[PDB]
Amino acid sequence: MLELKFVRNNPDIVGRALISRNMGTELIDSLLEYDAAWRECLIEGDDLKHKRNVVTREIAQLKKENKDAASRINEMQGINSRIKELDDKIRDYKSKINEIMLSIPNIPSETTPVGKDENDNPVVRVVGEPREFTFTPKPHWEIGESLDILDFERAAKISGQGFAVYKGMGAKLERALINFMLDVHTRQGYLEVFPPVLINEKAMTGTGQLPKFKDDMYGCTDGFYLAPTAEVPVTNLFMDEYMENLPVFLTAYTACFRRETRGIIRNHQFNKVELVKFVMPETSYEELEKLTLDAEEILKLLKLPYRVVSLCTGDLGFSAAKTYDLEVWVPTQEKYREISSCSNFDNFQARRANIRYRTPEGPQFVHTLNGSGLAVGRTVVAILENYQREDGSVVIPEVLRPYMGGAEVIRPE
Ligand SMILES: Nc1ncnc2c1ncn2[C@@H]1O[C@H](COS(=O)(=O)NC(=O)[C@@H](N)CO)[C@@H](O)[C@H]1O
Ligand SMILES: [Cl-]
Ligand SMILES: [K+]
């Protein structure tokens, strides 16, 4: 969430932010009405609480001077009743202000381009040259079923639609990618952590998934949610702390769960290796450029042609101030497809989760950043498509061979 005082003082900064996201400004209008009622009730109640303290002492003084106190004791019943009414209103208004503040998206950065949707996302850079095929490439689901390394029919029987079972060299490729990704990020300076994927409500609120995106998440017995991304458990590790040794760079593998495209492009469960940073505010714009480079290094090392796109205001996520997407080439679609989002959140998540650090002039919120390095299933799609042979077998990218016993090609078994 934003800072309430800042929204009060700059309603047309915030309102134009919400129009740039294709929203109206009704939430700001509502917020400022409830805020004004809170402020006026606090003034009236603080005055009456002071008066009740004085009248209590006046009654004591009248009793010591042997004077009748009945008119004062009468006034006190009215004071006490009006105070109770004002406190009940203040309780209601604060609850309404908190609900509204948790629903207002982050302010887009000054370098986020203005646009309405994904058609207005500028291309930042194009890296690598897409393969020129001499035969007609097959999509990843046809290659995976023919090699018997992806099983959709048996996944549907145990789970349902939108799942996959990896088998044999498919399972070994996914495992090799995760190991490779975590090893490279370790060399880049990230600390490997492995957290749970059952998340409480406070953590899911902290990164912005709740309350707005509750219906997109799996909820579980005992009040838990399944993580939609390692962003949720990892970022919230430092909830209600003062952080040390900034910047802090973490990386994690987790399974990811989303209620929600063919094959493994869009599934209810998928694997992802995430990058998370906690940094001092003046450094976060450069930390985003550096995190993006750390994520795209995986694509460069795997020799998978890609491009980097800048998300416009209309396509930006709720909690993000600035995002770059990595988009990998998909031969059968003759287009690039999202494989990562890399974002700066400014202090939006840090305010929600109370993640601060000490400065000589007092405490400040950290900035948080994250990015996919990478979604593993979509990397398997990009390998099966871009490394396929005319015979339907798939060449194993050179960097993964040491993680696969020196295997060079996935063939039918
Ligand atoms: N349902 C899904 N199935 C498979 N892959 C997915 C699905 N949803 C997202 N992805 C992949 O996961 C990446 C990260 O998801 S994200 O929502 O864009 N961003 C995040 O979750 C951030 N925490 C950065 O990882 C995507 O860019 C996409 O490549
Ligand atoms: Cl306007
Ligand atoms: K939007």
Residue ranges per domain, the chain? 1-105, 106-413
By residue count, the chain amounts to 413
| Residue linked to tokens 């990618």 | 177
- Residue 24 Cα to ligand 3 middle (Å): 11
The β-bridge relationship of strands 367-375 and 269-279 is antiparallel
Q: How far apart are CA 131 and CA 306, in angstroms?
A: 11
Instruction: State the virtual CA torsion across 368, 369, 375, 376 in degrees, nearest 10.
Output: -80
Nearest to 171 by CA among 410, 408, 406, 332: 410
Locate the DSSP E strands across 294-376.
306-310, 322-330, 335-344, 355-357, 364-365, 367-375
Span between the terminal Cα atoms of the chain, in Å: 53
Q: Residue 370 has which token pair?
A: 């994250």
Sequence-distant (≥ 6) Cβ neighbours of residue 351 within 8 angstroms? 1, 2, 3, 365
180: which DSSP letter? H
Question: Could you identify the atom of ligand 1 that is nearest to the CA of residue 373?
Answer: 25
Q: How far apart are CA 192 and CA 362, in angstroms?
A: 31
Question: Which residue type is seen at 396?
Answer: I
Helix (H, G, I), strand (E, B) or coil at 200: coil
**Burial of 30: CB neighbours in 10 Å, binned 0-12, 13-18, 19+:** middle
Q: How far apart are CA 373 and CA 390, in angstroms?
A: 30
| Residue linked to tokens 């993964």 | 400
Resolution in A: 1.5
Experimental technique behind these coordinates: X-ray
Q: How far apart are CA 175 and CA 185, in angstroms?
A: 16
Helix (H, G, I), strand (E, B) or coil at 346: coil
Phi, psi of 107 (to 5 degrees): -70, 120
Among 154, 262, 266, 358, the active-site one is 266
Q: How far apart are CA 255 and CA 234, in angstroms?
A: 13
Q: At what angle do helices 11-20 and 26-64 cross, to 10 degrees?
A: 150
Residue 260 counted as an annotated binding residue = yes
Q: Residue 396 has which token pair?
A: 């194993």
Distance (Å) of CA 330 to CA 117, 125, 381: 22, 17, 8
| Residue linked to tokens 């208004």 | 93
Nearest to 240 by CA among 353, 345, 346: 353
Peptide bond just before 18 cis, omega within 30 deg: no
For ligand 1, atom 18: residue with the closest CA:
341
Give every strand in the sheet of 355-357, ordered side by side. 241-242, 355-357, 364-365
Q: Write the DSSP string, 30-62.
A: HHHHHHHHHHHHHHHHHHHHHHHHHHHHHHHHH
Distance (Å) of CA 382 to CA 9, 271, 304, 332, 375: 48, 15, 7, 10, 11
The β-bridge relationship of strands 224-226 and 322-330 is unpaired
Phi, psi of 291 (to 5 degrees): -60, -45
Diameter over CA atoms, the chain: 110
H-helix or E-strand containing 20? helix 11-20
Q: Facing residues of 110 across strands? A: none
- Answer yes or no: are the C-beta atoms of 166 and 379 closer than 8 Å: no
Nearest to 201 by CA among 222, 183, 170: 222
Question: Which residue type is seen at 102?
Answer: L
Tell me which residues have their CB closer than 6 angstroms to ligand 1: 229, 231, 258, 260, 266-267, 270, 272, 274, 338-341, 370-372, 375, 377-378
Helix (H, G, I), strand (E, B) or coil at 312: coil
Nearest to 122 by CA among 359, 307, 247: 307
Question: Which residue type is seen at 43?
Answer: I
| Residue linked to tokens 């749970």 | 196
Q: Residue 87 has which token pair?
A: 């406190």
Q: Give CA angle at 221 (215, 223), nearest 5°.
A: 65
